[PDB]
Amino acid sequence: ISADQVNQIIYNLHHDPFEILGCHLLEEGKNTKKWVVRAYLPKAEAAWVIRPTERKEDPMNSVHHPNFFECIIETPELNHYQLKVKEGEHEKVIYDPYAFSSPYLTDEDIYLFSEGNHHRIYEKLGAHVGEINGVKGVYFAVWAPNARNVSVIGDFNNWDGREHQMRKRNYTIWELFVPEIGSGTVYKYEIKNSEGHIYEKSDPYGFYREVRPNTASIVVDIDNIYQWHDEEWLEKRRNSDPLKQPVSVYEVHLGSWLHGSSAEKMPLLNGEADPVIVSEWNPGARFLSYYELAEKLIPYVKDMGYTHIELLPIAEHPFDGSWGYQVTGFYSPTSRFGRPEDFMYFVDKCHENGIGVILDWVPGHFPKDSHGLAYFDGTHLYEHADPRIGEHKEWGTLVFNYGRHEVRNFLVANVLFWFDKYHVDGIRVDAVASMLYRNYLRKEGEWIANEYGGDEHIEAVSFIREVNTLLFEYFPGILSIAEESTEWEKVSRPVYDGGLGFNLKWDMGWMHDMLDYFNIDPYFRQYHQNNVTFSMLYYYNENFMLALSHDEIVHGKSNMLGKMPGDEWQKYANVRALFTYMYTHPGKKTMFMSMEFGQWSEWNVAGDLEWHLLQYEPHQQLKQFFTDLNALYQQEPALYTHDFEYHGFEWIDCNDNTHSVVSFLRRSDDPNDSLVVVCNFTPQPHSHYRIGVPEAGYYVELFNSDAKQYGGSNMGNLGGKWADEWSFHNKPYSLDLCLPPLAVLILKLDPTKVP
Ligand SMILES: [Mg+2]
Ligand SMILES: [Mg+2]
Ligand SMILES: [Mg+2]
C-alpha cells in the first residue's frame, strides 16, 4: 500500500475502507495464495494476526503511519483469523472488524457452510441489519434445501408473505432483503414443503424471541446494542491456565433463584418490559430480568466468595419444566429474563466483579415442537432420518445428525457464538454418553452398530472433538466441562492423545460415594470407609470437577440437610464436614443454589428459593461457613495449584475405619504452603488423636468446621499445636490433636513462630 491510501484512512477521507482494510488476495501460487491483512488500530503500538486453527501467529508491521498495520501471509485460504492488538501494557483479541464487506452470503460463505467449516455462519444466516442497493433494511437467510418455497412473515406485512418470498441460492439457502425495517421486527419463516404443506418456523439462527409460549423471532442489531468493559478480564483469562487456579462454581437456575412481584414491570438496562409471570399456578410471581440478576445475584455470589457462576441452559426453550435442557432457539438467550443486551450486561458485570460465567450447553438433542428445528424443510434436516440414531425415544426428543455438514456447522458455530458475542468463560455439557453411544437407552434389535461393529457413535465423537479443538484454539483459557457417566476414557484429555478434548469432567462416582456415605448412620460408616477413599484410585485419569449438582436435590432425594442422619445439630455438622472435605479433596468445586444456606426443601423450579430461612441463625451460620471456606480456598495455594499432580496430595493415614477418621496433605510449589487435613466423620470427639506431619514446628489451626460461628460446638486445638518429635504414620514428627465431632480441621505450619 501507498502513503496516500494510508492517509486517506487515517484522516477519514477514504470513500470505502473495506477496499483496503481486512483480508485481501494479493496473488495465487501453485499450491497456495498470498494474502494481506490490513488494520487501522488507533492507539495500538503493535498487532498480530492469529490463525488459531493452524496454531500460527504472525506479526503485523506499521506501514506509513504507526497505527496502520499490514501483515502478509501465505496460505491456501485465510478464512479463520483474529487480530491481537496491543495498546500500552494491554492486549485484546478480536475478530477483524473489516472481515465482511456486505450483509449477503458470498460464494465463499456458501461453500464453507456446505463443508461444515463456516465458524462464523451466524454473521450471515438468521437476520441482520444492513445495507443492500443503497438502502437500509434487514437481510434474512435460512437453510432449507428441500423446501418448495419460503417467505418472510412478520409484523411488517401482517403475516402475509406473498410479496416477501425468498430467493433460493445454490439449491440450499433462501434469502431476502427487506428495506426499511430494523431491530425489533417480529418475524417467522413460512415454509412450503415438497408435499405442498404450509407451516411456520422460528428462525434457527434467531438472536431473540418472543416470550414463551409465543415463538416469533425478533431482529437484533447484535453488535450495536451493548458496550463492554471486560478487556482486562479477557486478557487475564486468555493468558492463564484455569486448571491451576481456584475454581468454585455456584450453579444457578436463573428462573428459580429469586422471583419478583408480577404487579410491576420487569426493569431492564435503561428500559422496562411487561412482567413474565412465572406460572398460572403462582400468578403473583414474576421472573427477574438479566439486569436485576446482575444487580442481586452477582454481589451475592461475590460476597459468598465463589469464582464462577454456572447457568442452567439459557438458550431459548419453550417449557419451564425442562429446566432449559430442551432447547429450540439455540442462538438467543431466553426472553424470560429480558433482552440480549441485558444478558451481555450480566456477563460484563460478572467480569467486573472478577466472576466467570459457565453455560450449560445442550447439543445432544432437541424437542419435537413444531416452531423449532424438527422436520425443518419437510425432511429430516437437523435430525437423522433413522430413528434408531435420530430419536431418544425415552425422552421424546430428536438427535442431531452430527455427520451432516450443515448440522455440525450449526452446533460448532453455536458454541463459538456464546464465547464471541456473549463473552462467556466456559461451557458444561450434560449427559455426554447420550451422544457417544449408538445403543444409548435402546434395547436389543433397536439400534445398529457402527461400520466397525462397535457401539461408538463415530460422528458424535468426531463432532465433540471438533467443538473442543476449536474452542480452545479460538479462546484459550476457557473451561470445557463434561458429565459423562459410563467411564469412557480420556474425556478430559487432548484430542491429539485420543481424548474428547474437555479440560474438566464431573466426578459422578465421587458424588455418589460421598452422598451415600454421609447418608449412612455414623456408627455404620466404619463399614464404608472405602467410600471416603476409593475415588483417589482413579482420580489421576481425568481432571475432575467435584460437583454436587441440582440433579441431586430433586425427585425425592432431599436437599443436603435432609440427606443427613441425626438431630438438627448433627445434620448441619454433617453438611459442614462433607463440604470441608469436598473443598480439601483434590479437584475443582461445583455446588448448587440453596445448598449454601441449608434449604430444607428440595429444589422446586415452580417457586424460588426459601430466602426467609436466612432470618434464622442456623442458616446464617452455615452461610458464613461457606463464605469463609470459599475465602480459604482462594487464599491457600495448596488447595488449587496441584489438583491434578501427584505432588498435590498424599494420604497421611486412612485405615482408622473404626473411628471414621482420615487425614492427608495438600501441597503447592512452596513447601511452607503445605496443609494438613484431618477429618472426623462421627459425632464422637477425640481429645488425643495423633497424626503424623512432615516437619517440626507449630501447626496453626487454620480452619475448623466445628467453630461456633459455623454453628459448631467450638471444640478444637485453641489456635494450633506444636509437633512432637515422635514418629507416626511413617513420618518423623506428629501432632496430638483434639478432633471435634463431625468435623474437619485444616492445619498449616507457621515456620516463623516463637518457641
Ligand atoms: Mg398467508
Ligand atoms: Mg459400598
Ligand atoms: Mg418463594
From TrEMBL:
Residues binding Mg(2+), per UniProt: D608
E.C. number(s) listed in UniProt: 2.4.1.18
GO annotation, cellular component aspect: cytosol
Matching SUPFAM superfamilies: (Trans)glycosidases, E set domains, Glycosyl hydrolase domain
InterPro entries given in the database record: A-amylase/branching_C, Branching_enzy, GH, GH13_cat_dom, GlgB, GlgB_N, GlgB_N_E_set_prok, Glyco_hydro_13_N
UniProtKB keywords: Carbohydrate metabolism, Glycogen biosynthesis, Glycogen metabolism, Glycosyltransferase, Metal-binding, Transferase
Signal peptide: none
Listed pathway(s): Glycan biosynthesis; glycogen biosynthesis
Domain Glycosyl hydrolase family 13 catalytic: 275-633
Assembly and interaction partners: Monomer.
Role of this protein: Catalyzes the formation of the alpha-1,6-glucosidic linkages in glycogen by scission of a 1,4-alpha-linked oligosaccharide from growing alpha-1,4-glucan chains and the subsequent attachment of the oligosaccharide to the alpha-1,6 position.
Catalytic residues, chain numbering: D430, E483
Protein name per its UniProtKB record: 1,4-alpha-glucan branching enzyme GlgB
GO molecular-function terms, A-Z: 1,4-alpha-glucan branching enzyme activity; hydrolase activity, hydrolyzing O-glycosyl compounds; metal ion binding
One family name in Pfam for this protein: GlgB_N
Keyword Ubl conjugation tagged: no
UniProt record, GO biological process: glycogen biosynthetic process
Catalytic activity: Transfers a segment of a (1->4)-alpha-D-glucan chain to a primary hydroxy group in a similar glucan chain
Annotated family: Belongs to the glycosyl hydrolase 13 family. GlgB subfamily.
